[PDB]
Design an enzyme around this catalytic site. Structure first.
Site, PDB file in Angstrom:
ATOM      1  CE  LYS C   9      -3.789  -1.826   2.816  1.00  0.00           C
ATOM      2  NZ  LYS C   9      -4.118  -1.646   4.245  1.00  0.00           N
ATOM      3  CE1 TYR C  49      -9.190  -0.097  -0.795  1.00  0.00           C
ATOM      4  CE2 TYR C  49      -9.636  -1.507   1.108  1.00  0.00           C
ATOM      5  CZ  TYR C  49      -8.744  -0.785   0.330  1.00  0.00           C
ATOM      6  OH  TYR C  49      -7.397  -0.756   0.661  1.00  0.00           O
ATOM      7  CG  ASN C 112      -2.993  -2.347   7.648  1.00  0.00           C
ATOM      8  OD1 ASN C 112      -3.033  -1.820   6.529  1.00  0.00           O
ATOM      9  ND2 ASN C 112      -3.923  -3.164   8.073  1.00  0.00           N
ATOM     10  CG  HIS C 115      -4.817  -6.355   0.477  1.00  0.00           C
ATOM     11  ND1 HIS C 115      -5.985  -6.560   1.184  1.00  0.00           N
ATOM     12  CD2 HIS C 115      -4.876  -7.182  -0.597  1.00  0.00           C
ATOM     13  CE1 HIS C 115      -6.721  -7.456   0.554  1.00  0.00           C
ATOM     14  NE2 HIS C 115      -6.072  -7.847  -0.531  1.00  0.00           N
ATOM     15  CD  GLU C 126      -8.393  -9.241  -2.550  1.00  0.00           C
ATOM     16  OE1 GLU C 126      -7.281  -9.808  -2.439  1.00  0.00           O
ATOM     17  OE2 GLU C 126      -9.063  -8.867  -1.555  1.00  0.00           O
TER      18      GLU C 126
END
Lengths: 148, 148, 148, 148, 148, 148
Positions: C9, C49, C112, C115, C126
Site C-alpha cells: 500500500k 473495497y 498497516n 494487503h 482480487e
C-alpha cells in the site's frame, strides 16, 4: 573448476560468526562439499602452516589455532579459490573493503576471523589435509545450472 | 542444561538455507558442540526414524533423507531442546508463526527444511546416533557468562 | 493449490518497504506469478473495497489507495492464502506478532503497510481485478520440487 | 500517544546487540526521543528497581545493572508501551516467540538482554528517571504522516 | 537527473533474488518509476540485444532471455545509471567486489543475475523499449527531499 | 589505539538509518565509548565546521546540522579513524563502493548520511567538542581479546 579450503578460526567462532560466513559462501553460489566443527590437532596445524616452519611466530600461531575450536569447509566452483579470497578480503582487515568478511568484521590481522586458500597448490594441500576423503559429499543441485 | 540434535534436511540444503539456520541458532546463544555436512547411510536413517518402523511412508521417508545431503548439528544450553523447537516452529509450516525457520521458509510438511529433537529421550538418541563422541567439541566461550 | 493477491500500500511504498515485502514472500517459497508497480484507477479501488460500498470511511479509504502508488503481486502455492495472512499478521499492527510484516513495521490499523487476500473468494476476485490474464507469468522453477 | 523507556542491559551490550535493538525499534516506526550510553549511578538503579526494595535478589540485581554499561532509549508512538513489549517478548526468553528480541537472542531470564516499560505508570516513572528534560529531543519526521 | 533500466534476468529469478535486488535499489534511495514481472517477447529481446545482431552467441543469448522470466525495473535519481552499475558490479562476478549484487551472489558471467543500463544512450533506449509510457508511475516521496 | 567521532546526520536520522549505522560499527569490532541523540547547538556546529569559517555554503551547512537532529558516537580501537572512513565510504556517494554506508544508502554529497572523523587531529577535536568527559563510558568487553 576448483575447490578451496575455508576455515573459521577461533576468533570467528568466539565472536559468533560461523553462520554468517557459511551463509556468505552459500549465497555466492559455490557448492558446499565438506564441513565440520572441530578441535584441531597440533600435527595438522603444523602442516597447515608449514611455510612458516622456522620463524619466531610459528609456536604462538600454531598454539592459537590448535587450541581451537575452528570451523572447516570446502567449497566448489569455477575459480572458487579467487572467489574465496574475494569474499574474505585482504590479510589486514584495515585494508579490507567493506562488504568482505574482514572488511565487515575484523580490526587487526592477528584476529582476521577466517582463512581462505591462497593458491591452487595451497588449496590442494589444505583440502586433503583438513578433511578425509569420506567427508567429501557428492550431491547435485537442482538449481546448479542457473549458477554455472 | 541440555543438548539437542538439529538437522538441515535435503530440502534445506538444496534451497541454500544451511547458513541461515546455523546463524539463527548461533545468535540465539546456544553453544555449538558438533556439526558436519554428510551423505547419511540408510542404517542411520532407519534408526533415526525407528518410531515409524512399520508404517506405509517409512520407505519413502528414509529414502528421502538417506539420498541426502544433510547438515548435522548439536547445540547446548539450558532448555536447548525446547529452544530448538521454538526456533524451528511447528511440524506444519502453514501453522508456523513468522519468525521461525518453518514460518519464514516452509510451505508443506513434507518439505519442512529442518529437524529439531522432540524430547530429552529423542535428543539423547539422536546426538549419539548422528555424531561419534570424538566429534564433540569441548571449548569455552569468553562471552558465555553473559548468555547463561 | 492457490493464488493470493498481495499489495504493498502507499504507506509501504513511501517507507521503502516494497523490496523487503517481495523478499519475504520469495523466501517463503511461494511462486511469483504477477507483479507491477502502479497508480491504480478509482474504479479498481472502489471494486476492491466493494464490501464497504455504503460506509462512512469509504471515500477516504478509496482516495488513499487510488492516489497511490501501490505495488501489486500474485503469489502461488499450497495454502498460499493462509500463508499470505501468516506473513502479513493481524489487521492491527499492535496485535501482530514480531516476525510478521505488520508486527515488524506497522504501528496503527490505517497504516498497516500491505494487503493480503483474506479468503478464497476474495483472492479469486482480487487476482482477476488487479491483473489482466496477459500479466500472469507461466514458468517453471528448477528448485520448485524441493518446496512443495 | 505514549512514551516508553527501552534499555539495553549489560548482557545486551556485551553481546554486541545495541544496534540490532535500536534498529528494530526504528524499523517498527516508533519515533526516537532520547538515547544515551552510560554507566548508571547506583542511586538511579535502586530507584528504578524500587518495587523490589526488600527481597533476596535486590543487592545482586542492582550491582549487575549499576556495574553497567547500559544503553538507554525513549520511544514515542500510539500505544508505544505495548509495542515495546511486543518487540521485546515475554520475561522469560524460553517462553518468548521467535521474531522478538528475547525470542531471537535470549536463553535465560537473568540475561534477557533488554528492558521495556511494563505499563503507563512504569513508563512515566522510568522516562523521568533515566533521562533529564534537556535530553529529550523535539523533531519532526517528513515520513511520519505515513506511519501514524 | 537520470532514469536507468534494471532487469533481473532468468537466473536471478530462478535463484529467488528479485526481492534482494529490488530492496538494494530501494535502500540506495533511487526512486522507483516502473516495475513488472514478465515473459519477454522475442521481438523485444532481439531489439534490446541488437548491438550483437551478427555474432556466434546471438541465438542462444536471445533464447535464454526470451524464454524468461525476467523482472523489469526503472529507477530514477541524480546519476542513476552510474549508480546502477555501482550496485550491480562489473560484467564478470569473479571481478566484482563484495557488496555488489554480482560480487555477493554471482560466479560466472553467463549467469550474472541482473542487467543494468550501461550509458545514457543505452538507458533511454532500454526504458522506451521494455516499458510503455503508461507503465511509468508519477508520484512524490515525502522523504525524498532528504535523499537529493 | 584511537577514538573516532561518528555522527548520523539529519538525513540519516530522517531515513531511519541510526540503528543500521550503529550496528555496522558494532559488528566491525570497535568498542563504543559514547553515544547520544541530540539537537545540536549552533556553537558546536560552527566549531565543527570551523575549517570552512569563511566560505559561501557555510551558513547553509551550519543551519542544516544545527536544525538536527543528530546521533553522536565515539568508537575506539586500533586504527579506528581509518576504519571509520572505511565503513562510511568516500565523501560522495556515487563514488563510494557497495558495502559502505554511503555506497549502500547515499545518492549525493549533500545527503551523505553520516560523518566520520577524517584524521587524528580532527578526531581529537571532534571527540572533546561533541562530548563531555562525563559522557565517556569506561567498560571492559569479555569478548574484547578476540577482536584486538
Amino acid at each position: 573448476m576448483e575447490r578451496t579450503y575455508i576455515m573459521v578460526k577461533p576468533d570467528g567462532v568466539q565472536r559468533g560468526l560461523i553462520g554468517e560466513i557459511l551463509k556468505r559462501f552459500e549465497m555466492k553460489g559455490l557448492k558446499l562439499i565438506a564441513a565440520k566443527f572441530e578441535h584441531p590437532t597440533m600435527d595438522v596445524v603444523a602442516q597447515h602452516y608449514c611455510e612458516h616452519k622456522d620463524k619466531p611466530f610459528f609456536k604462538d600461531l600454531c598454539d592459537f589455532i590448535s587450541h581451537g575450536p575452528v570451523f572447516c569447509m570446502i567449497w566448489e566452483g569455477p575459480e572458487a579459490i579467487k572467489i574465496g579470497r574475494n569474499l574474505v578480503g585482504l590479510t589486514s582487515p584495515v585494508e579490507s573493503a567493506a562488504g568482505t568478511i574482514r572488511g565487515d568484521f575484523g580490526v587487526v590481522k592477528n584476529f582476521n576471523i577466517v582463512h581462505a586458500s591462497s593458491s591452487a597448490e595451497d588449496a590442494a594441500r589444505e583440502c586433503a589435509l583438513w578433511f578425509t576423503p569420506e567427508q567429501l559429499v557428492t550431491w547435485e543441485r537442482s538449481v546448479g545450472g542457473w549458477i554455472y
